[PDB]
């Protein structure tokens, strides 16, 4: 029938993890080392077919790869939800305080 696609995506791993394909950039503050440098690169080089494709962003330093490898457990990938990525909402989704 008619479904809210954002509500449906909360039932996926997007509701529990950082979705590299969808989650707004401010959620990368939740773990040490991601924001803003690695977060900017992850959002820019999306979409990914798996989490481990995040170690193929080119130009990453060796310590940057080590940060990402520590944090692969907190990442997920889903389908690109157009409701979450259009309008620049991955950079500013109108949520502040």
């Amino acid at each position: 029938e008619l479904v809210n696609v954002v509500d449906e995506k909360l039932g996926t791993a997007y509701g529990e993890k950082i979705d590299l394909n969808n989650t707004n950039i401010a959620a990368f503050i939740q773990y040490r080392g991601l924001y803003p440098t690695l977060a900017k690169l992850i959002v820019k080089n999306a979409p990914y077919e798996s989490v481990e494709d995040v170690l193929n962003i080119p130009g990453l330093t060796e310590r940057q790869k080590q940060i990402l490898r520590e944090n692969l457990e907190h990442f997920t990938v889903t389908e690109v939800e157009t409701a979450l990525v259009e309008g620049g909402d991955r950079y500013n989704n109108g949520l502040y305080k």
Binding site: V3, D7, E8, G11
Partner: protein, 56 residues
């Protein structure tokens, strides 16, 4: 949170619902206390509460 709803007694006795739209619509009715089936068609009921003779 994986919210499901099961019904005991009444029309939907022994039934369980898991899909989140359906569970939510019952949760919204559950704010009103007990959940009833209503015939809205006979009187063309508008869905907005009215007071009783006690209130009037």
């Amino acid at each position: 949170q994986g919210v499901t709803v099961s019904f005991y007694g009444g029309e939907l006795n022994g039934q369980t619902f898991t899909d989140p739209p359906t569970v939510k619509s019952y949760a919204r009715k559950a704010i009103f206390g007990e959940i009833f089936e209503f015939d809205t068609e006979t009187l063309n009921s508008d869905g907005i509460f009215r007071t009783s003779p006690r209130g009037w």
